[PDB]
Amino acid sequence: VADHSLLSIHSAKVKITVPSGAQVKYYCKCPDVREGITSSDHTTTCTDVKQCRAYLIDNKKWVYNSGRLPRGEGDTFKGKLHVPFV
Amino acid sequence: XXXXXXXXXXXXXXXXXXXXXXXXXXXXXXXXXXXXXXXXXXXXXXXXXXXXXXXXXXXXXXXXXXXXXXXXXXXXXXXXXXXXXXXXXXXXXXXXXXXXXXXXXXXXXXXXXXXXXXXXXXXXXXXXXXXXXXXXXXXXXXXXXXXXXXXXXXXXXXXXXXXXXXXXXXXXXXXXXXXXXXXXXXXXXXXXXXXXXXXXXXXXXXXXXXXXXXXXXXXXXXXXXXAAA
């Protein structure tokens, strides 16, 4: 999911942080760190918040497979879950 | 003449503190255009990454030293620092400073260069020092082997490591074998340094070992004569 509250500024560089050590998937239009599986990183190259990957791979809890969900590209994880109201 | 030079080694007691300095000089760039690592190598082990800093912000620490080591940098003096607190027996290592151009602000990636320091020894134990006694290993006229004689010096009964041994102030380097130290049954280290030379120069040319043991401040120059021995 997007969270641009992360992408603060390190007084000249755009500064990403992390929720709790969650997995933040990061790079900018410029060339800098290209995956992002990290704690709070900085950004050597780009400066603008509006050209960077504020992402939250936070798959400690599954979800409903809404059409209004972006796919977790990695895998079909488990989490078969009932319906109450039959 | 790009250079990184460590200082601050020593023998420190458990649960105490120590501070390591790495001085930076030479280059074609401003001070602050580098990211800096501290790396340590324990006796008989691989390389452990300790921590990083760049412009005084991008930091991070290994869980081995997290909440125990603080890395810092002074860009006006060209100095990288590691302050270490609450030392343990498992921090005993050669610490190296190293510089990275990948994470520098100015980002001149095409002209990339690393550079590593010379390494600084931190030993965590109950403290002490002892300088070596240095003894000639004398070449014998009967030990003339095909026009080649060997001579050397024995560097004995020192603590802790390391000693450095040179021959003729660095003027003799060919055929020189400085052995690894052996831990004796006395708990003290010993090593030999040897060299092979033409037998024809015995008693006509002077051979001097130069032995330096920094923890005791011992510097000893030892003449080796052609004493059969």
Pairing of strands B17-25, B79-85: antiparallel
- Distant-in-sequence contacts of B177-183, Cβ < 8 A, 24+ apart: none
B43 Cβ contact list (under 8 Å, min separation 6): B92, B93
B174 Cβ contact list (under 8 Å, min separation 6): B195
Distance from CA of B83 to the nearest CA of A (A): 22
Q: How many residues make up chain B in this entry?
A: 229
Single out the residue of B40, B50, B4, B60 nearest to residue A33, CA to CA.
Answer: B60
Nearest residue in A to B101, CA atom = A44
Distance from CA of B34 to the nearest CA of A (A): 11
Residues of B in contact with A8 (CB under 8 A): none
Q: Where are the beta strands (DSSP E) in B86-161?
A: 93-100, 120-124, 133-137, 148-158
Give the rounded distance of the alpha carbon of B177 from its chain centre.
18
Single out the residue of B163, B173, B126, B153 nearest to residue B224, CA to CA.
Answer: B153
| Best of A33, A40, A42 to mutate (most B CBs within 10 Å, chain B) | A42
Q: Would you give the end-to-end CA distance of chain B in angstroms?
A: 44
Question: Are residues A42 and B58, on separate chains, in Cβ contact within 8 Å?
Answer: yes
CB atoms within 10 A of CB A74: 8
DSSP result, A34-72: -S--SSS---SS---GGGB--B-B-TTS-----TTS---
Residues of A in contact with B102 (CB under 8 A): 44
B67 Cβ contact list (under 8 Å, min separation 6): B61
- In degrees and rounded to multiples of 5, residue B142 shows phi and psi of -80, -15
Question: Are residues A39 and B60, on separate chains, in Cβ contact within 8 Å?
Answer: yes
Cis bond before residue B160 (omega within 30° of 0): yes
Residues of A in contact with B103 (CB under 8 A): 44
Question: Are residues A44 and B104, on separate chains, in Cβ contact within 8 Å?
Answer: yes
The structure tokens 């130069």 sit at B210
* Resolution of this entry, Å: 5.2
A11 Cβ contact list (under 8 Å, min separation 6): B57
Q: How many residues make up chain A in this entry?
A: 86
Nearest residue in A to B109, CA atom = A31
| Best of A44, A45, A47 to mutate (most B CBs within 10 Å, chain B) | A44
Nearest-5° angle of CA B197, CA B198, CA B200? Answer: 135
Single out the residue of B83, B49, B42, B73 nearest to residue B63, CA to CA.
Answer: B49
Residues of B in contact with A13 (CB under 8 A): 105
Answer for the pair B18, B122: CB distance below 8 angstroms, yes or no: yes
Single out the residue of B62, B127, B126 nearest to residue B95, CA to CA.
Answer: B62
Question: Are residues A42 and B107, on separate chains, in Cβ contact within 8 Å?
Answer: no
CB atoms within 10 A of CB B109: 12
Q: Would you give the end-to-end CA distance of chain A in angstroms?
A: 31
Single out the residue of B12, B41, B36 nearest to residue B98, CA to CA.
Answer: B36
Q: How far apart are CA A34 and CA B175, in angstroms?
A: 50
Experimentally determined by: cryo-EM
B97 Cβ contact list (under 8 Å, min separation 6): B4, B6, B22, B36, B37, B38, B39, B80, B116, B117
Question: Are residues A12 and B105, on separate chains, in Cβ contact within 8 Å?
Answer: yes
| Best of B57, B100, B101 to mutate (most A CBs within 10 Å, chain A) | B57
- In degrees and rounded to multiples of 5, residue B199 shows phi and psi of -60, -30
